[PDB]
Design an enzyme around this catalytic site. Structure first.
Site, PDB file in Angstrom:
ATOM      1  N   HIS A 256       0.802  -1.230   0.000  1.00 30.31           N
ATOM      2  CA  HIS A 256       0.000   0.000   0.000  1.00 30.31           C
ATOM      3  C   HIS A 256       0.837   1.284   0.000  1.00 30.31           C
ATOM      4  O   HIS A 256       0.266   2.345  -0.257  1.00 30.31           O
ATOM      5  CB  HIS A 256      -1.022   0.005   1.153  1.00 30.31           C
ATOM      6  CG  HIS A 256      -0.477   0.429   2.483  1.00 30.31           C
ATOM      7  ND1 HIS A 256      -1.274   0.988   3.461  1.00 30.31           N
ATOM      8  CD2 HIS A 256       0.767   0.347   3.018  1.00 30.31           C
ATOM      9  CE1 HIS A 256      -0.545   1.239   4.535  1.00 30.31           C
ATOM     10  NE2 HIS A 256       0.697   0.858   4.293  1.00 30.31           N
ATOM     11  N   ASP A 257       2.167   1.217   0.188  1.00 31.96           N
ATOM     12  CA  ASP A 257       3.046   2.384   0.029  1.00 31.96           C
ATOM     13  C   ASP A 257       3.363   2.734  -1.423  1.00 31.96           C
ATOM     14  O   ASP A 257       4.030   3.754  -1.659  1.00 31.96           O
ATOM     15  CB  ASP A 257       4.407   2.134   0.706  1.00 31.96           C
ATOM     16  CG  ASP A 257       4.321   2.029   2.205  1.00 31.96           C
ATOM     17  OD1 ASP A 257       3.336   2.496   2.787  1.00 31.96           O
ATOM     18  OD2 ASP A 257       5.261   1.471   2.803  1.00 31.96           O
ATOM     19  N   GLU A 284      -2.560  -6.736   4.736  1.00 35.63           N
ATOM     20  CA  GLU A 284      -3.024  -5.412   4.327  1.00 35.63           C
ATOM     21  C   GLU A 284      -4.462  -5.249   4.774  1.00 35.63           C
ATOM     22  O   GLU A 284      -5.186  -6.232   4.945  1.00 35.63           O
ATOM     23  CB  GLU A 284      -2.973  -5.204   2.804  1.00 35.63           C
ATOM     24  CG  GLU A 284      -1.578  -5.114   2.176  1.00 35.63           C
ATOM     25  CD  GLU A 284      -0.882  -3.763   2.364  1.00 35.63           C
ATOM     26  OE1 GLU A 284      -1.370  -2.916   3.152  1.00 35.63           O
ATOM     27  OE2 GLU A 284       0.176  -3.568   1.731  1.00 35.63           O
ATOM     28  N   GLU A 316      -4.782   2.272  -1.067  1.00 34.58           N
ATOM     29  CA  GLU A 316      -5.421   1.033  -0.655  1.00 34.58           C
ATOM     30  C   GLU A 316      -6.155   0.408  -1.842  1.00 34.58           C
ATOM     31  O   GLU A 316      -6.487   1.079  -2.827  1.00 34.58           O
ATOM     32  CB  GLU A 316      -6.372   1.277   0.522  1.00 34.58           C
ATOM     33  CG  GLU A 316      -5.700   2.048   1.671  1.00 34.58           C
ATOM     34  CD  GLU A 316      -4.589   1.283   2.366  1.00 34.58           C
ATOM     35  OE1 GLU A 316      -4.613   0.032   2.350  1.00 34.58           O
ATOM     36  OE2 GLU A 316      -3.704   1.942   2.968  1.00 34.58           O
TER      37      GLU A 316
END
Lengths: 351, 339
Positions: A256-257, A284, A316
């Site tokens: 998600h980064d 996640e 996300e």
């Protein structure tokens, strides 16, 4: 629920727009700042220490290090807002205040863990100042709100202001402990593993906690050049260049980064590091396919918006999107394991 | 069993006002409104009305709109992406037939200088006589763009409130004379008299404020200090005055009103009131939010319940309090001097 409710006839509508009700939208900024103040004054632990207790403002300020004679009247203005918003329970006698189901998580458990570090970080002044520029992500390609607000990136800023650095580190640590506590109750996929390479992640805490519960796993912590835990070998490197040979890989809040192209490249480097039959284990929060006013939705929407301000390339994703990443990296079998409240463990299996 | 995992979602509380501010600044609510009643627009359709070069503008915008839809500020229908329309509360973010909306008040209460001061509200509990704004910015609020935001917030709020007062409260129609205490340069009183032309108006304000005042039809200007005395008249208007002052100063103002009125005269008071029982509703937050802003900006002031307003009036010598609820916590109150 008692009572008989007939469908009956149609409710008559009100005429016009009542703009006076819309003035109440100012509750949205006041509530988080009132909550932040109450956390910093330790209100929730003071109530908890009293035992379904409800405490008056005088009883609460008795436990706060102040000698301000007007402390109770000042504190009541803050608590009134939290009571109206159902963060505190209220009995009107003045008022006395107690915990609600919603606020029990603000009290530290046996081991000192609560959600407080996360809440304090996400409402930190440096983060909230950058949120004023989130619209720039819509208007201009490539602009990072934090960088525009502060003239440097989030990690450069945190390295100057150690207060932000402690606050961020404690937040990630608390969130990870909380999430893995639930993972270990539901997810069974560590059971027969013998080796696990944690890619990304930081100090190695999450991996050490896995090996504590699964003592046959030999751990490797693979991280960028900047506390050795037994059975955890530390290897420095850049996952975009390559990942060390690995029977299985752990990706905890890494994907998600990064945007899709970079997440795919991480997973491609994972694929080529794995043997046939090796697995990537991804932890996640997942965006629900249908959003609503519920914990599952906000546990994905909230980090998504914090990413938009700190790191807008990260995002996300839904389960469908995660499967799309896996297929773009050559994984042919994917398995999804709902844990709780939108948290998932996903397995990407190499043929 | 404490659900700490769900509790991480309390971080939504800071995200929601900042997403709402972004959408107001992108003009999202007016763009939806101009699509017509019950319209629901895709992010691509909204972005087509926003000047931007950015090819990923629609995806980025949906990250904000998603949050507002999940929080019920926008309505949502899921196609196969989502489309967004207005709700009752977001309809207040679009200007009405009179050109005004709640947007100026929302932008002021979430303005940077105000929110930065909110970080020091705990200092009011911890240290006697600290003003959060002063500690934050090293100076007074009025000493401290921001002045624009503040004036327009207070003006929009007063315009919205009085448009409703005039619809519901009928107590101005037969007045013969009215003193507006703290009337500024007298514009607001002049506009009351425009609606009720038989009223003879007196604008009463501090001398340096009135020095700048133009001449208005039906209005006479009188300069002075309300803590020393109020001009003689049949009726006195206190709009948004008493919540700025503690009980002792409020009673002093009202004792001066009592002296200035004839037997049978009235003070008309326009204020939001704190409900007896607080709830998750605008009737509570329309007094709680100003109360928190004053704690951050104007120590001394406070919001009050109807029972507390009656207490002030009776302590100032008035024989009867009469309440006219308007809506959403707004009240007109009449304090009557015995005949």
């Amino acid at each position: 629920s008692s009572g008989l409710v007939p469908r009956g006839s149609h409710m008559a509508l009100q005429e016009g727009v009542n703009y006076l009700s819309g003035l109440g939208l100012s509750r949205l900024i006041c509530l988080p700042m009132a909550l932040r103040a109450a956390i910093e004054l330790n209100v929730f632990e003071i109530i908890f220490q009293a035992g379904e207790a409800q405490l008056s403002p005088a009883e609460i300020v008795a436990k706060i290090p102040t000698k301000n004679p007007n402390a109770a009247i000042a504190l009541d203005r803050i608590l009134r807002m939290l009571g109206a918003s159902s963060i505190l329970s209220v009995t009107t006698m003045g008022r006395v205040y107690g915990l609600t189901e919603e606020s029990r998580c603000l009290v530290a458990d046996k081991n000192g863990v609560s959600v407080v570090p996360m809440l304090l970080f996400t409402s930190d002044k440096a983060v909230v100042e950058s949120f004023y520029n989130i619209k720039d992500v819509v208007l201009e390609e490539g602009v990072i709100p934090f960088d525009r607000t502060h003239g440097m990136d989030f990690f450069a800023y945190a390295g100057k202001e150690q207060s932000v650095n402690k606050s961020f580190n404690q937040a990630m640590g608390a969130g990870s402990t909380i999430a893995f506590d639930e993972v270990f109750k539901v997810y069974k996929g560590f059971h027969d593993l013998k080796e696990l390479v944690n890619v990304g992640g930081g100090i190695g805490t999450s991996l050490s906690n896995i090996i504590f519960k699964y003592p046959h796993i030999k751990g490797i912590n693979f991280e960028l050049p900047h506390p050795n835990y037994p059975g955890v070998e530390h290897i420095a490197g850049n996952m975009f260049e390559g990942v060390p040979n690995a029977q299985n890989i752990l990706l905890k809040w890494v994907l998600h980064d990064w945007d899709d192209e970079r997440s795919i490249k991480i997973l491609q480097n994972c694929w080529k590091a794995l043997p046939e039959g090796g697995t990537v284990i991804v932890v996640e929060f997942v965006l629900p396919q249908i959003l609503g006013n519920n914990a599952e939705s906000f546990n994905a929407l909230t980090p998504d918006l914090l990413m938009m301000t700190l790191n807008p390339g990260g995002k996300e994703r839904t389960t469908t999107e995660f499967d799309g990443l896996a297929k773009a990296a050559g994984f042919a079998e994917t398995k999804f394991f709902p844990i709780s409240q939108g948290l998932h463990v996903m397995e990407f299996h190499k043929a």
